[PDB]
Write a protein that binds this DNA or RNA. Sequence first.
RNA 1: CGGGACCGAGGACCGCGCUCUGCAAGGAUGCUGGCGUAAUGGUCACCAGCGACCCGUCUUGAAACACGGACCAAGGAGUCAAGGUUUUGCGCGAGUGUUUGGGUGUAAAACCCGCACGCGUAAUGAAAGUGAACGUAGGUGAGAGCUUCGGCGCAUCAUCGAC
RNA 2: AAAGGGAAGCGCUUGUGACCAGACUUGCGCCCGGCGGAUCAUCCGGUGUUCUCACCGGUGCACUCCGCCGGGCUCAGGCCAG
Lengths: 126, 52, 108, 150, 51, 139
Amino acid sequence: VAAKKHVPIVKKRTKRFMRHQSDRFKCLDSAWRKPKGIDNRVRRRFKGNLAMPSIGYGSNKKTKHMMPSGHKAFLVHNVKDVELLLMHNRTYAAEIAHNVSSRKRIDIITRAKQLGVKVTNAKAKV
Amino acid sequence: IKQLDAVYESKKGFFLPANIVSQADLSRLINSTEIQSVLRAPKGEARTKRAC
Amino acid sequence: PTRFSKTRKHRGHVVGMRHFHLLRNHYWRPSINIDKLWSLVPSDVREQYLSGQKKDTAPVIDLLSHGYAKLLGKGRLPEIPVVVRARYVSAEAERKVKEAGGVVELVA
Amino acid sequence: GIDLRWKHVRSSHRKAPKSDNVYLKLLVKLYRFLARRTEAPFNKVVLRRLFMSRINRPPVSLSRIARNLKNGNEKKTVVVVATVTDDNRLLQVPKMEVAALRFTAKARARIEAAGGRTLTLDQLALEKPTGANTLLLRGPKNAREAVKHF
Amino acid sequence: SRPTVTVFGADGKPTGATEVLPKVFSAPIRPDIVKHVHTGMAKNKRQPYAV
Amino acid sequence: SNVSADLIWEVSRNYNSFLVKQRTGTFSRDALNLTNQHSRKHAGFVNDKALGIVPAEKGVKVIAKKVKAANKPASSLYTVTYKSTARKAYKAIASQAAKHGYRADLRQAAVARASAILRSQRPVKPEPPKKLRGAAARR
RNA sequence: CGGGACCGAGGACCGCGCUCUGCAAGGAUGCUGGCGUAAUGGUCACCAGCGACCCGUCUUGAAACACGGACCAAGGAGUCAAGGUUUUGCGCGAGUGUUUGGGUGUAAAACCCGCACGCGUAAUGAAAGUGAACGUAGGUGAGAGCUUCGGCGCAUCAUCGAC
RNA sequence: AAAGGGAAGCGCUUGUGACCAGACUUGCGCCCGGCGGAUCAUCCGGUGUUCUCACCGGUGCACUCCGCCGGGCUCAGGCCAG
């Protein structure tokens, strides 16, 4: 069904925090690592450099963990898991685990449409 | 279930332990008349109105 | 446990005399004060003695059976006659026993 | 920027026990309620002493309790937030009403034999919720080998 | 008086017999101490390994 | 004594077999749990008086704890099956939840769960067909 | 008295008020239009304006010098034992420690047992040796808490005494 | 597929092209009309319970309850805006 009324979702930053020199070295994954060298310009926060993550980028407490539809994802593996969202169909949306077979997926989607629960990946294995 | 008492009485150097709490029902303890009759009046509610 | 160590947190950021042939069994004399003397009496008869159901009976205490050789004089005794059999005794302990009305017997 | 020569200081006292004892958690909840809803300083002191550790709660013996029972304190209820131990050097135990966190077996037996009463802290909260007619006692804090070698 | 517990037969129905509950069932329930002792005894059947 | 609902909550507040913990919330698989949330208010296995609502073939099935049969699990549940009008079901559920002081704080949650089950027992309307959108999906 | 920009946090009522049928008074509502899909939004590649030295190590006050780095995968560096010490949790408590050993076992588990022994309960002296109450276990000044509202006074501190 | 007048790579912000995730499709409540049924109110007996609340069997005889189908009305509904 439609989600519960909420404040607008505001993302302070949508770009990821890329690791320094990961764009030049293939042995460096792009996942964030804080520079610990004393002369590092990203660590010393010179202008024109990569930003570093900090708690000031944090998301709104009324809005954190919410998808753009206004729901929170709940991972389900079976019908007994999707029936835990009987009382939360306006705040939580079911998300079927990746290793659930197609028959069980049909069962979960049928039960979720009975309960009025949104499934985020209902088109899978069709 | 008849021999359990004799088993726990036959243990040397050990006794059934004394508890630090005699009445484990905190709701009865708090909402009893003996405590509630001497309490100060409430200074607010669960939800506080925003003043300004 | 390894997982609670700070190193896992730091992952990423690095006269007189000489006595030849001393035998310690020569100098074995444990000591007990008179304030713990009634603790050597078993509990029930101790309670009877302290309450006063034994006005014609005096307890005899062997300190060597309990593991003591000298009776020392710290504390005070009640007004009960007690026979104490000990290898050693101090003057103040024996004096307080005589005030209490007992006698200190010397044994070996 | 703002010039702050002084610095705001975080609290240097315990707000919650480190113990995982669920009974102690229930006692802490009860005395939090009592300290918040009563004006008696006894409840606040008892809550703070429940927060403390073992070396900050030294044992209190029956000889110490009998010493503090003298001079008009014979009818007051003795409150110790630490354990109560037995003293063999005390031959005659006076009649007393003691509420403690815990008792040793000898201390409890000798109190009951002398004719007193042993209480827990929740029974103390039931009978004396404001700490009326109470004698709050502590043991010798500096009586440790570590404190001697300090 | 102390509480009683019903004795059931081989048919799953009560036999009419009741027995006094032992005093160990009123002992304090201490999960922290149970965890400590369980952590201690779970290592007492281990076999050593070394290179 | 040494056992109470407060103690059972202190024991099982961090872990029990009903607990379902994820990033976006903590749930409970209890039968006596209204709203399926892990809290002292809704821990039916913890609390001495508790309610639970289960769907039936038609209508709801409400179980309640019996205070005098706590140590007898086979006879500890008072069960009523409501296969009737929804308004009468809500009336009887609120009556057993609030009239005699048997967990009056669970009244709204119990009526809400009964309404949710009665909604779920309705026939499901067919979904509209998915519209293909854009360039690569459309062609 | 106009003209313009940015913003709309909260979510039943309560309050302070006023111009008092109500209100601009403890946080935006009312009306209307187009569209209902890639239109908004997002990701990727590129162009444009502005910004932006190559990382690690070492040195001193600092740079500079110097050293390592063709690239990728996997491996790769504060560990364990014993002995102390401080702090935390727990059990018992003037005692405490079953597990050298014996009993038992569903068998390297779990359960049970007790003699000795270790540490603690007494110190001091090189040693022989001796060995801790004058007093409600002392007086005075503070001291949480309690109080019958006169005081009693925990821990602890300072000081004078006693053994 | 794209860029290239002696470096490329990176940050902020638009644009172009390519490719996408959502959201939405209507719900709820009244007034009528037409159907299909009596798990409507009261009363009686039994049973269980929280000891006054419910379930079960009879009683309803259709101005009462419960679903369905056609309309009408009110409210709430997506994106960008004045």
